[PDB]
Amino acid sequence: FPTLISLLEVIEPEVLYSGYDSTDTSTRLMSTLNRLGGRQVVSAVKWAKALPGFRNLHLDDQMTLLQYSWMSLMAFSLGWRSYKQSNGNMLCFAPDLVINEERMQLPYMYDQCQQMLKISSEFVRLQVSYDEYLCMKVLLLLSTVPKDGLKSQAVFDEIRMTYIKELGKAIVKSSQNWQRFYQLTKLLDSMHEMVGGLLQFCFYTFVNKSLSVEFPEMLAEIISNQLPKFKAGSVKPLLFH
C-alpha cells in the first residue's frame, strides 16, 4: 500500500504532442524534434524529482545522471512508443508527428532514423511488457555516470539494485527471475552503444551553426555543457555483462 512498481506506473509522464505544422524540409523537421525533445526532457525532470530515492542523491549526481542519460531516456521512450503504436513499423515521436518509411527518404534523416528504430526493434524482439519497460527506463537514468564515479557514491549504489530488484519482480510476473534478466539486461547494455550514435549526431548539429538547426534553451544549456565532458570520453556505461 502502495507498490513502488505501481508508483512507477503513475509518475510516468504523459505522451507529448509535437504541435507540428504538418504542411516538409528536413532542417525544419529536426528543428521541431528538438523543440519537442526539450519539453520531453523538462517532463523527465519532474519525473526524476518524483522518483523514490532521487531527492536524496546529491544535486550534482542529479544533474549528472540526467545530463548523461537524457538522450538514453528519450530514445528509449521513443522506442516504446514506436513499438506500442506501429508495432515497430514507424517512429512515433508524438501522435501528431510520426515518421513513416516515406519521411526517412528525407535528406539527412535516414541514418539516425534507422538507429532509432533499432531501439523500437528491440522492444519488438523481446516483446517487452509495460511494467518491464518502466523498470529499465528507470535504470537507464542510473546507467550513465562519470569515469570517476559519483558525488554521493553509496546512495546511488543501493538505489540501482533497488530498481533492478523491481525489474526482477516485473518478470517474476517461474524460471525467469534470473533468466529473462539476461535478454533484458543485454538491452540495457546495448543501449549505451546505440545511444552513442544519436547522441553524436545531435552534438554535430549543435555546434555546427551553419546548418540552421534550432535547439531550445533547455537542451542547448545541457548539450553545450555535456559537450566537453563527452569529448574526453570520461563517461562510464555501467553494464551487466
Binding site: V45, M63, S224
Partner: peptide, 13 residues
C-alpha cells in the same frame, strides 16, 4: 557553468 534551467528545477529557492 552547469546548465541554468536544468539546475533551477532541481534546487528551487
Amino acid at each position: 557553468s552547469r546548465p541554468a534551467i536544468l539546475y533551477a528545477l532541481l534546487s528551487s529557492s
